[PDB]
Amino acid sequence: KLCSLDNGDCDQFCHEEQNSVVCSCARGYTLADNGKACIPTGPYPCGKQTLE
Amino acid sequence: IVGGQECKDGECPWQALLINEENEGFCGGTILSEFYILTAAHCLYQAKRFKVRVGDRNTEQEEGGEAVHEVEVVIKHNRFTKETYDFDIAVLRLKTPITFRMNVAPACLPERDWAESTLMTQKTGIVSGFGRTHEKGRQSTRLKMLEVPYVDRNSCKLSSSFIITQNMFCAGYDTKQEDACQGDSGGPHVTRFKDTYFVTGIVSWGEGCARKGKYGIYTKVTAFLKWIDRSMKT
Ligand SMILES: CCC(=O)CN([C@H]1C=CN([C@@H](C)C(=O)N2CCOCC2)C1=O)S(=O)(=O)c1ccc2cc(Cl)ccc2c1
Ligand SMILES: [Ca+2]
Structure with missing residues (x-):
């Protein structure tokens, strides 16, 4: 249930608040419109292996 | 390593x-x-x-x-x-x-509750460094990495001659000859989640390197x- 079921469908952090899943992201990312995916705000975001 | x-x-x-x-x-x-x-x-x-x-x-x-x-x-x-x-x-x-x-x-800093429940319960983490390749040997000229299993807390305490505080956790192998070593101290222990890497530990200490019945001890970043x-x- 909730965060215990596939990370609550969140890309990164999952929290259980009241009866529902609430997703969030690390510093340097913003939460997408769908409230689940995390979008890098700029070049070389934290935690990503470098390709260029 | x-x-x-x-x-x-x-x-x-x-x-x-x-x-x-x-x-x-x-x-x-x-x-x-x-x-x-x-x-x-x-x-x-x-x-x-x-x-x-x-x-x-x-x-x-x-x-x-x-x-x-x-x-x-x-x-x-x-x-x-x-x-x-x-x-x-x-x-x-x-x-x-x-x-x-x-x-x-x-590397990304995670939130405490999520990291302890979701990252630290994965099967493995990753340690890296330019440290000794053998307990009594020389440091590596190449940057190395190693996948290390998270180790049950009670098992680790039983195997240790030194105290394991609330500020430490154990990772590595019982008998397999793989571990961090001298010169790796201070380096990263990271955990992967959906292609993003989060810092979960700091290389801290061990009773020698890769010894039988002994594990690698890491500072508990969370x-x-x-x-x-x-x-x-x-
Ligand atoms: C000269 C520095 C040195 O030899 C350190 N190394 C180990 C030898 C003894 N210790 C521990 C037991 C120690 O001295 N502590 C006393 C204070 O309380 C904590 C324990 C060592 O750490 S080492 O170079 O073989 C070494 C260092 C870091 C390591 C990190 C990992 Cl994850 C695994 C093995 C390590 C070994
Ligand atoms: Ca170089």
């Missing part, structure tokens, strides 16, 4: 190396942001003057991404104790900002997240 493999191009970009007056590495570190490096407090008693090098995979050849940075402020945890290595954590603020590029990027946040604003 005993056992393991080489980090391939761009795979370990958060690796930092603490270098002495002779340009020799003595400890590792993790890049947290353009101004801050995470390391072990015990590494601070290993050199009078030192600098930090990033973007390096081979200490014997110029690759194109190497950069040396001077240290402006050293912030060591005031409760660190050499007796047990409890609170083995420090943050370094650099004089000049790190310019991110191929092989140079920060217990220090508020502390790290305070140190990075000052």
Whole structure:
């Protein structure tokens, strides 16, 4: 249930608040419109292996 | 690193190396942001003057991404104790900002509750460094990485001749000859989740390297997240 079921469908952090899943992201990312995916705000975001 | 493999191009970009007056590495570190490096407090008693090098995979050849940075402020945890290595954590603020590029990027800091419930319950984490390849051997010229299983807490306490505090966790193998070693101290322990890497530990100590019935002991980063946040604003 909730965060215990596939990370609550969140890309990164999952929290259980009241009866529902609430997703969030690390510093340097913003939460997408769908409230689940995390979008890098700029070049070389934290935690990503470098390709260029 | 005993056992393991080489980090391939761009795979370990958060690796930092603490270098002495002779340009020799003595400890590792993790890049947290353009101004801050995470390391072990015990590494601070290993050199009078030192600098930090990033973007390096081979200490014997110029690759194109190497950069040396001077240290402006050293912030060591005031409760660190050499007796047990409890609170083995420090943050370094650099004089000049790190310019991110191929092989140079920060690892993510996770939130405590989620990291303890979701990251630290995965099967494995990843340790890296330029440390000794054998307990009594020499340091590696190549940057190495190694997948290390999370180890049951009760099993680790039973195997240890030294106290395991609330500020430590265990990772590695019982008999398989793979582990971190001298010179890797202060380096990164990261956990992967959906292709994003989060810092979960700091290479701290061990009774020798890769010995039978003994594990690698890491500083429990999740217990220090508020502390790290305070140190990075000052
Ligand atoms: C000269 C420094 C040295 O030899 C350190 N190494 C180990 C030898 C003893 N210790 C521990 C037991 C120790 O001295 N402590 C006393 C204070 O309380 C904590 C324990 C070592 O750490 S080492 O170079 O073989 C070494 C260092 C770091 C390691 C990190 C991991 Cl994850 C695994 C093995 C390590 C071995
Ligand atoms: Ca090089």
